[PDB]
Amino acid sequence: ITPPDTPTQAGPENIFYDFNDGARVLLPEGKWHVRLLDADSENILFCCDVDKGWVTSSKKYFVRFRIQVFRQGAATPLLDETLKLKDRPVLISFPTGTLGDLLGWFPYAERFQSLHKCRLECTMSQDIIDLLAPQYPQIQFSTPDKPRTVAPYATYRVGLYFGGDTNNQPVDFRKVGFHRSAGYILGVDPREAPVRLDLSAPRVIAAPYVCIATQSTCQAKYWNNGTGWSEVIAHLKSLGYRVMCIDRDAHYGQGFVWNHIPWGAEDFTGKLPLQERVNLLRHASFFIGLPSGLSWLAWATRIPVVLISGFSLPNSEFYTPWRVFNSHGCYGCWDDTSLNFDHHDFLWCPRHKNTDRQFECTRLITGAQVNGVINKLHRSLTEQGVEAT
Amino acid sequence: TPPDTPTQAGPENIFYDFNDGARVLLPEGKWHVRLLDADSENILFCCDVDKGWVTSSKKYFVRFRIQVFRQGAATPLLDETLKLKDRPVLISFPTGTLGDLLGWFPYAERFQSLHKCRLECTMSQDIIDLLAPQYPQIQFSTPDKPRTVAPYATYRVGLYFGGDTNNQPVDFRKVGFHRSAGYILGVDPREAPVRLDLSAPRVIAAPYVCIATQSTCQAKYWNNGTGWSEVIAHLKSLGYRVMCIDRDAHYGQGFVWNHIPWGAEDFTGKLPLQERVNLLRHASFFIGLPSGLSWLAWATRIPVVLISGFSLPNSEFYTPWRVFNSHGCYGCWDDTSLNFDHHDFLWCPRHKNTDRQFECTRLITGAQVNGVINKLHRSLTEQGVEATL
Amino acid sequence: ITPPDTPTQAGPENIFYDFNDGARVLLPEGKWHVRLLDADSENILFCCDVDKGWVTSSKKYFVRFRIQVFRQGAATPLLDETLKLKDRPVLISFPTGTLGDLLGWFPYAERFQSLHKCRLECTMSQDIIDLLAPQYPQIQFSTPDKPRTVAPYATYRVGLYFGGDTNNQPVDFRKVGFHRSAGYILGVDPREAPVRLDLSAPRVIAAPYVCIATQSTCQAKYWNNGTGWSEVIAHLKSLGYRVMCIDRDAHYGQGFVWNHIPWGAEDFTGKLPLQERVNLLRHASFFIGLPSGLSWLAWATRIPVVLISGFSLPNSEFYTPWRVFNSHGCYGCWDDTSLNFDHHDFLWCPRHKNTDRQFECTRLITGAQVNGVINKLHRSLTEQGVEAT
Ligand SMILES: [Fe+3]
Ligand SMILES: [Fe+3]
Ligand SMILES: [Fe+3]
């Protein structure tokens, strides 16, 4: 996933400059004074004297950089080029991060291209490509190992950067929301939007039904209330809905802590292509889930989404009137800039790990609370149209 | 200031309330009290009190359920659940600045439409004159002359510092100072402009732009030496007349004073806000700071160029013309590890009394602002007023 | 700044002596006894036995020195030379200091020449040369880098010496006044006088007008009263005067502290030749300024000068009945021998930096105070003239 070993642009004096991984310039032997500017503000971002080697901007997100190379003590610069992306090869590289990450990030990539009118290629796992590519003919999708461009003018690496990093992102993603961070990185309208999907599939299950997602990547994201899911599933049926579980896994966990597809839900679990999930989701009356990926997919299918989460604040994901949250105990571990997410600890709870208050984030969210929300949504579905937002 | 005695009204002598945030007062002799959240059915607080006031630690909106038990009895004496329909409710704002109130107010209207209550709001006369005509369903008064006298519930909308989570559900710095009001009242947290009287006819014939350069602390000022002057000169070169509409022409502390910029026309002074609304309405656009006039300008439906470095772009209302620089210190105001000082006009927690003081806004050059002005100007001439907003 | 590397006058046995940088004698290879005397008092200033190398007076200001060199055992001296400046090449070197410095010092250089009847060359920036040279045909003007007399008999470097230095100046300039110090250095009548200017230019602006200078070299010299300038400018107009600001810069400052041409003053700013400023000043009814340079120029064009200053005492600059000063708080940072001016700190206030009281020097000088003195000046002008003394 590395940038070219040598910058892709030819400077007048055997000098190569690049905007892959930020503004780069490789100097041949000589005497130089190099300047990086922000073209929009005219500010001098960085400035130094060197003989040969590398000069790279500390900022890696989108900046309209302007590179200037001077012979020490000269009046005009030998090289003076400003980033201009129109009709030029650009690479946006996503990591093979979770599903929710990409569905959140991706629209911002399309915005970047409409704005700059560049030749854009994006890199991600094949399964997302199969899901999205047809709806974005403007953009070329590839895999990290076989990108078509080979030599690009500019590259941007959209992802999450922890520990408050402000070199790869303009603002800490925790301040703006993990998905909106993509917009800031790329310098586009940061307002959230759903991906475009193939919503042409015809209805298969005739009766009214609801989809649910109970599994996630860490325990904190689970709804850790003892009887929550069982109370919800029972209630959904008492309203006349069939209930299907569409989690990738039927059992998931670590050590002795294991989570299983709830008794009473239908087994639509399994790892299959996302398009099949889209097709099933499309005709669901609504969806109940966690802040992991499937909720973003449900969102993009244009159906109501009941989102249950205590470890993140309501503004941490896309807006839904059906968001569930409880503010009486610990909440928002995830958005707190004084704490640090541990990728390796599935049982991560910064403030209460190994105490009887562990995962209070979600234990305070009762089935009654979730059913209350479901009742309002149900009334709105009967009494008002589906169209009623 | 809640009533000295709860305004209910419970069948036995003791009176219960929701004015501070609930409240029960019990005559001498033992009882056991239970506070619940009707939505989740969780027991929030539980105790035995022989005498005195028992009140919830949470003061923001919750569907409280008060239960009073005789010791060791199985059934409760009192079991009242908050129901606001057709009842006197008081929303008390502080006499804070303009921007605060304009930002918060729409949430109070939402609270009313949701609960169908009899709502009275308390605020400075100044704002009442501006808003009252457009919110006929709500009663407006001043803090010293409230008409309700006896209210069923009271809610105190404001900013609470130091990470307080008793008067607000979530630290306002995590959600935005204005959106906090929606969380306190428990309604749709999405920002909206207030409704104004936009009937006034055009007075100044030629195209013009309004600007606001003053603010409440030095950090909210545009501390770039030549910023304003470069902008004002540029505006004129595009054919715009420029008017300054700040309440004061000179404002500051100690030796630090800010003045209406040379070259701007003098429309300053403490006028009724409606006159500012009338002038603003026909301005091609507005340039200001995260202070109050920007919120007024917003609500008059004209494009707003908003310059701010101490505040992240997300925090105020959205505008595609937000100016922000991410290369140095930024966001003093949103940072939960720091603390705003009301008494220090020269507040800069990270760089006070150093070379970098107010870097927040010194990095924002006139060129940067003129770049944004140029795009907005282009969009106004190319497209219409429709197509921008 | 540099004196010849070898003294310009030849003594008998290969000794070179001169007075360029104090009294100097370069001795080659012998056992010598050297005495420096003050011919006026006959005092032996310095006395020593030296084998080879340099012997210079510690005193560098004007002294009628008498150099005597002895063989170690000798009854009488082989060098008996005593300073005599008649018809001899003398160099007076000014630093490239501010305008007020030079205009204050210069008259004393002319006095030194009238007194001693020598051939005098002066070194200073070109812009001052253009202003003065025509009125001082007796004196030869040059710039520091291109001096015409490469072998001078005596040299004197007029300037400010800090830290109570008494080797380059007879007495601390803070005790006698920065401008008068020049006369002490040169040993002439120390009484202040204005420079001779070309006052022949004809009137251009017909109506009555006042010139003002609001900018300066450090913040302490600004009139840091919040509403001062604005109140003065408004008042001048109500008296029928047009007001022009003639500062070199329209904006000046450092960090976040910036000063701008006051709203309401006509813009006559910019880096123009001083002769254009003299021509404009000449016909002004009067001038209002700070202890910086333009006030000295105003003075010399023979118009009444209102001088506002708190960081220096009234006697610190030239006499004017229109000097404005406030004695109730901190004043006179500048004249205080126990403090030290900081050339590198634009926000220097030794007593009160970084406190509420910073620049109390001039916050105590209100617009009312200045308008009071303007009123008196105005009455005297309408009634008596011009001639006003
Ligand atoms: Fe937690
Ligand atoms: Fe700051
Ligand atoms: Fe002082």
GROMACS .gro file of N, CA, C and O in nm, chain B residues 184-222:
model
  156
  573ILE      N    1  -3.088   1.839   2.627
  573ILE     CA    2  -3.146   1.873   2.756
  573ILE      C    3  -3.298   1.852   2.756
  573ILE      O    4  -3.355   1.804   2.854
  574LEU      N    5  -3.362   1.889   2.646
  574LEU     CA    6  -3.506   1.880   2.636
  574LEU      C    7  -3.550   1.744   2.580
  574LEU      O    8  -3.669   1.711   2.579
  575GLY      N    9  -3.452   1.667   2.532
  575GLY     CA   10  -3.479   1.534   2.478
  575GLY      C   11  -3.551   1.533   2.345
  575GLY      O   12  -3.631   1.444   2.319
  576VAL      N   13  -3.523   1.628   2.259
  576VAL     CA   14  -3.587   1.630   2.128
  576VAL      C   15  -3.486   1.610   2.014
  576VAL      O   16  -3.365   1.602   2.036
  577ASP      N   17  -3.537   1.599   1.892
  577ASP     CA   18  -3.451   1.596   1.773
  577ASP      C   19  -3.340   1.701   1.792
  577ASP      O   20  -3.368   1.822   1.804
  578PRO      N   21  -3.214   1.657   1.796
  578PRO     CA   22  -3.103   1.747   1.824
  578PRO      C   23  -3.053   1.829   1.704
  578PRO      O   24  -2.964   1.911   1.719
  579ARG      N   25  -3.111   1.808   1.587
  579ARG     CA   26  -3.065   1.878   1.467
  579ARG      C   27  -3.089   2.028   1.467
  579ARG      O   28  -3.198   2.074   1.494
  580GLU      N   29  -2.985   2.103   1.435
  580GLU     CA   30  -2.990   2.250   1.434
  580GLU      C   31  -3.093   2.301   1.335
  580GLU      O   32  -3.114   2.241   1.229
  581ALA      N   33  -3.156   2.414   1.371
  581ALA     CA   34  -3.249   2.486   1.282
  581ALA      C   35  -3.237   2.636   1.309
  581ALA      O   36  -3.196   2.677   1.419
  582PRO      N   37  -3.269   2.719   1.208
  582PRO     CA   38  -3.270   2.863   1.228
  582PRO      C   39  -3.401   2.905   1.294
  582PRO      O   40  -3.500   2.833   1.284
  583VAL      N   41  -3.400   3.016   1.368
  583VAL     CA   42  -3.524   3.069   1.424
  583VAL      C   43  -3.606   3.127   1.310
  583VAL      O   44  -3.555   3.146   1.197
  584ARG      N   45  -3.735   3.148   1.335
  584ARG     CA   46  -3.822   3.210   1.236
  584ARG      C   47  -3.833   3.360   1.266
  584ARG      O   48  -3.850   3.401   1.381
  585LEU      N   49  -3.815   3.440   1.163
  585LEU     CA   50  -3.810   3.585   1.177
  585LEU      C   51  -3.909   3.655   1.085
  585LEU      O   52  -3.961   3.595   0.990
  586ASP      N   53  -3.929   3.783   1.111
  586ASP     CA   54  -4.011   3.866   1.026
  586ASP      C   55  -3.924   3.914   0.909
  586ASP      O   56  -3.843   4.006   0.925
  587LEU      N   57  -3.938   3.849   0.794
  587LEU     CA   58  -3.855   3.882   0.677
  587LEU      C   59  -3.935   3.955   0.573
  587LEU      O   60  -3.914   3.936   0.453
  588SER      N   61  -4.029   4.038   0.619
  588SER     CA   62  -4.121   4.108   0.530
  588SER      C   63  -4.069   4.246   0.485
  588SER      O   64  -4.114   4.299   0.384
  589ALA      N   65  -3.974   4.301   0.561
  589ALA     CA   66  -3.920   4.436   0.535
  589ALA      C   67  -3.866   4.454   0.391
  589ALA      O   68  -3.793   4.369   0.338
  590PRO      N   69  -3.904   4.567   0.327
  590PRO     CA   70  -3.866   4.594   0.188
  590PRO      C   71  -3.723   4.647   0.178
  590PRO      O   72  -3.671   4.706   0.274
  591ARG      N   73  -3.662   4.628   0.062
  591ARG     CA   74  -3.525   4.672   0.040
  591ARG      C   75  -3.507   4.825   0.047
  591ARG      O   76  -3.587   4.900  -0.009
  592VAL      N   77  -3.402   4.870   0.115
  592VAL     CA   78  -3.373   5.012   0.129
  592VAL      C   79  -3.252   5.053   0.046
  592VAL      O   80  -3.258   5.146  -0.033
  593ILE      N   81  -3.140   4.985   0.066
  593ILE     CA   82  -3.019   5.011  -0.009
  593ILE      C   83  -3.024   4.939  -0.143
  593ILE      O   84  -3.038   4.818  -0.147
  594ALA      N   85  -3.016   5.015  -0.251
  594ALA     CA   86  -3.036   4.957  -0.384
  594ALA      C   87  -2.921   4.869  -0.433
  594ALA      O   88  -2.943   4.757  -0.478
  595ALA      N   89  -2.799   4.920  -0.424
  595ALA     CA   90  -2.682   4.849  -0.477
  595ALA      C   91  -2.651   4.724  -0.393
  595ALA      O   92  -2.696   4.715  -0.277
  596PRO      N   93  -2.576   4.628  -0.451
  596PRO     CA   94  -2.532   4.509  -0.376
  596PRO      C   95  -2.444   4.548  -0.258
  596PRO      O   96  -2.355   4.633  -0.270
  597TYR      N   97  -2.465   4.483  -0.144
  597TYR     CA   98  -2.382   4.510  -0.028
  597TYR      C   99  -2.359   4.386   0.059
  597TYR      O  100  -2.430   4.287   0.047
  598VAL      N  101  -2.260   4.394   0.147
  598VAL     CA  102  -2.224   4.283   0.234
  598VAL      C  103  -2.220   4.334   0.376
  598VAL      O  104  -2.173   4.445   0.401
  599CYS      N  105  -2.270   4.256   0.470
  599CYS     CA  106  -2.259   4.295   0.610
  599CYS      C  107  -2.147   4.219   0.678
  599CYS      O  108  -2.118   4.105   0.642
  600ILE      N  109  -2.083   4.283   0.776
  600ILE     CA  110  -1.976   4.218   0.850
  600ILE      C  111  -1.992   4.245   0.999
  600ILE      O  112  -2.042   4.349   1.039
  601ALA      N  113  -1.948   4.149   1.080
  601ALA     CA  114  -1.944   4.164   1.225
  601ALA      C  115  -1.802   4.129   1.272
  601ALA      O  116  -1.755   4.017   1.251
  602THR      N  117  -1.732   4.225   1.330
  602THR     CA  118  -1.590   4.206   1.366
  602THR      C  119  -1.568   4.193   1.515
  602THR      O  120  -1.464   4.143   1.557
  603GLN      N  121  -1.666   4.238   1.594
  603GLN     CA  122  -1.660   4.235   1.742
  603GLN      C  123  -1.702   4.100   1.799
  603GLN      O  124  -1.774   4.024   1.735
  604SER      N  125  -1.659   4.071   1.921
  604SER     CA  126  -1.706   3.952   1.992
  604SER      C  127  -1.681   3.960   2.143
  604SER      O  128  -1.631   4.061   2.194
  605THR      N  129  -1.713   3.853   2.214
  605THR     CA  130  -1.708   3.858   2.360
  605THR      C  131  -1.575   3.827   2.424
  605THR      O  132  -1.552   3.863   2.539
  606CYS      N  133  -1.490   3.752   2.354
  606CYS     CA  134  -1.350   3.732   2.400
  606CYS      C  135  -1.257   3.745   2.283
  606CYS      O  136  -1.299   3.732   2.169
  607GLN      N  137  -1.131   3.774   2.310
  607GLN     CA  138  -1.035   3.802   2.204
  607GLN      C  139  -1.011   3.681   2.113
  607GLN      O  140  -0.980   3.699   1.997
  608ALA      N  141  -1.027   3.560   2.165
  608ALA     CA  142  -1.008   3.437   2.086
  608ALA      C  143  -1.106   3.425   1.967
  608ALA      O  144  -1.071   3.368   1.863
  609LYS      N  145  -1.228   3.478   1.983
  609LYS     CA  146  -1.329   3.475   1.877
  609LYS      C  147  -1.307   3.585   1.772
  609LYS      O  148  -1.371   3.583   1.666
  610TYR      N  149  -1.217   3.678   1.800
  610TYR     CA  150  -1.179   3.779   1.700
  610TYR      C  151  -1.089   3.721   1.594
  610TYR      O  152  -1.025   3.618   1.614
  611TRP      N  153  -1.085   3.786   1.480
  611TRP     CA  154  -0.996   3.743   1.373
  611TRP      C  155  -0.866   3.816   1.393
  611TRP      O  156  -0.849   3.930   1.351
   0.00000   0.00000   0.00000
